[PDB]
Amino acid sequence: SDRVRSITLGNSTITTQESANVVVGYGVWPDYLSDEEATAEDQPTQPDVATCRFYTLDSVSWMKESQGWWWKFPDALRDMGLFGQNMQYHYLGRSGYTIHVQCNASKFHQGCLLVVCVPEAEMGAANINEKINREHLSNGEVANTFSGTKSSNTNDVQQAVFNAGMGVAVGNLTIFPHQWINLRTNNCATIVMPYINSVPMDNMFRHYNFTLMIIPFAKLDYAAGSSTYIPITVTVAPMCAEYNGLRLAGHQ
């Protein structure tokens, strides 16, 4: 069967038995920066498998009236072992990513999830002409949560699901690399993002590269007696990461 997939990176391995098709990127596979498109002059640090491995983020709980969660991924991996340590000592860095989102239920359950990677998802503010705090955009490994109604918390992101924070129709987010976790048949949420930017290397802290969003379009629904606690676990790997411009320890 093609429902089974093993993914091996570093000293970490993910096995899935209800994959559908491992979704992977814009057609492009991640690779190291060539020296014909390069800008910086000193020797890069291709560190090892010590960064190119899976890291598990926190789990979010999918209830009957949950709306959606999001992450910012160069910033979410900022305390995840030696990867984050390289972020704190180098000025420029660069990596693709293997995102694998897991979630499981039983056959008596129903509900459908959308898992999108959105490049440059510049969020809009809840009150219009007002600053946004960094803790409301990216909270590290901890997810920020959309709402159903419009939000009006001060110095916060406008969080409605039907506008996705950015101000578009949420059914139009299937233009980005995505999958669905239909609980009837899926768990295979890969998106192997390449490096996507407008410059050959970039700073990990000053720039957010993309945004993972997990939005349930068909909400979770079950009969009385089934397991009511259904977690969603997000695991993320850097691929072909390299670092440049070593100096003192950075901005925590």
Binding site: D2, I7, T8, G10, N11, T15, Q17, T190
Partner: protein, 278 residues
Amino acid sequence: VVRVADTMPSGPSNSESIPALTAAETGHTSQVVPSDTIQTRHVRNFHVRSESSVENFLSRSACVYIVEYKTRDDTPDKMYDSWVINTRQVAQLRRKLEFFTYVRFDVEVTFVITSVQDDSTRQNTDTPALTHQIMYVPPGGPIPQAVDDYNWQTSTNPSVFWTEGNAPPRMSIPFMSVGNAYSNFYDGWSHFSQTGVYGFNTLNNMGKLYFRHVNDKTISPITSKVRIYFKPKHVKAWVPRPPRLCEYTHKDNVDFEPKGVTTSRTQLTISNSTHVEN
């Protein structure tokens, strides 16, 4: 020389090949090489599974037994001794042999004989060198009943003489069995009607050893003790078997007190230590 298998280098993987997902429901041990789940390097490994072979595991001079007898006793029965040959009165070699269900080997046998002057009033003597006789009686032969019995004249029975102070006695013994192999375990009866004696005691049938001092009755008592050391060699073994958990109780059966599986813990998870302080 048969070295252990080596570790091959590997890289990243994203495919429908799943070595981790197996079925342990099919009686089958998975053979996952460590180069299939993590990225490894080239390790040329030079280790040899040498001292874990069944010969290198069993061919040590183990034991079986201690035997005591005197050279001047008022009762004529403690002047010599005897021993029906089994390998099941000392637990270490018994457990090691009961790793397997069938065995086939030759035995190298060594005796270690030590004599102690007993307590009496006339304890200051001038005693010459004691000489010992160890006679083996095959299954069915005639048995001695005293130290001056004429059954000790060893015309057909193999016997060994030893003088105090020399190297210990040692002799080799071939595969002395009527079946194709020895039986560590026998699940059956002695009589065809499923009565009688149950277990491995039907198949022992090795004969017995007899021990005396060749000298005449001394003027002061000296007790001698000889330790029979069994040592197997030229070993083959068949249909392996789990190690025994419980303690042995007798030499003629497998009867036990019910012991738990392992040592206990206080909780099902681990953590850092909660003793004294920083």
